[PDB]
């Protein structure tokens, strides 16, 4: 009722206390190709039914290749779980995918053909999503003079990523830069890292864990929303993540942006 005016709230330590939550699971391909059945979905459905969860509440959206899944990951669902098939050769992309879809980025768009830019704080990054991004950046001193790159043309800058679909740069704060991409291929947005996102849980099925979400070198934390399990037959991975899906669900929480009370607080 009284919204958007953050007023203190009185609780108490004096009184003890004595369904509509929707799991929304994703999954990769070679798993499926090895499953060798078209009813597995129905088996998962009936199992969840016996576990206390309604039928018709769980949906399976499939991603083909990890780099393909990197674009536009609008994971809109009451509770989200992402099982990623690990690679010993595709690592940084997994780390940044985790970073993106586990945090909340509020971003504004840019027009690099015209404007200079500059990052502001250790919580400001540049996300870049699309087909084939080839970032071109050229730092500047205080009165717009090229440093290690020539601004009188375009092809002498210092590239930071090639053959990438989704990459999130972090630049030295407090200095202006010239920028180029192919603005018919992919798009870059200047995002502020507002606060952790709690709707999603990412678990990895493969080699060793690599996950960190802070682009800070010093702080490489292990959150709870990042889990790891081994495998030699995907059947057991599915069965098991449903065996403990109770604990997984109790770990996550409702998205602090869609709660009918997060009104006028960034998305509601």
């Amino acid at each position: 009722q009284n919204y958007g005016i953050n007023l203190p709230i009185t609780g108490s330590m004096d009184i003890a206390y004595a369904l509509t939550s929707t799991l929304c699971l994703y999954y990769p391909t070679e798993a499926a190709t090895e499953i060798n059945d078209n009813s597995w979905k129905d088996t998962l459905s009936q199992l969840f039914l016996t576990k206390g969860w309604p039928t018709g509440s769980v949906y399976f959206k499939e991603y083909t290749n990890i780099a393909s899944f990197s674009v536009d990951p609008q994971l809109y669902c009451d509770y989200n779980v992402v099982l990623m098939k690990y690679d010993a050769t595709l690592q940084l992309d997994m780390s940044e995918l985790a970073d993106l879809i586990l945090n909340e980025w509020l971003c504004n768009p840019m027009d690099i053909t015209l404007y200079y830019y500059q990052q502001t704080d250790e919580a400001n990054k540049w996300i870049s999503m699309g087909s084939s991004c080839t970032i071109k950046v050229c730092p500047l001193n205080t009165q717009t003079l090229g440093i290690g790159c020539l601004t009188t043309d375009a092809t002498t800058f210092e590239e930071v990523a090639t053959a990438e679909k989704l990459v999130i740069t972090d630049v030295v704060d407090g200095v202006n830069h010239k920028l180029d991409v192919t603005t018919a291929t992919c798009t870059i947005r200047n995002c502020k890292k507002l606060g952790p996102r709690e709707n999603v849980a990412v678990i990895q099925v493969g080699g060793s864990d690599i996950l960190d979400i802070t682009a800070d070198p010093t702080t490489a934390p292990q959150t709870e929303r990042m889990m790891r399990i081994n495998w030699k037959k995907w059947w057991q991975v599915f069965y098991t993540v449903v065996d403990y899906v109770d604990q997984i669900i109790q770990v996550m929480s409702k998205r602090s942006r869609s709660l009918n009370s997060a009104a006028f607080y960034y998305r509601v």
Binding site: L145, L150, T152, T156
Partner: protein
């Protein structure tokens, strides 16, 4: 073939009339020219 001659089996275009009074031969064909140009791309200039 040269009329009123004793030599047989003669070849080669003549210096007599290589054009037959007609016009120049015309040929349309492409040509590639790969060369090491001298060209200062952008440098050696005021940085201002």
């Amino acid at each position: 073939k040269l009329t009123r001659t004793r030599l047989d089996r003669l070849y080669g275009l003549p210096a007599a009339d290589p054009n037959n009074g007609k016009e120049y031969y015309e040929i349309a064909g492409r040509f590639s020219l790969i060369s090491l140009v001298p060209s200062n791309d952008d440098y050696q200039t005021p940085i201002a």
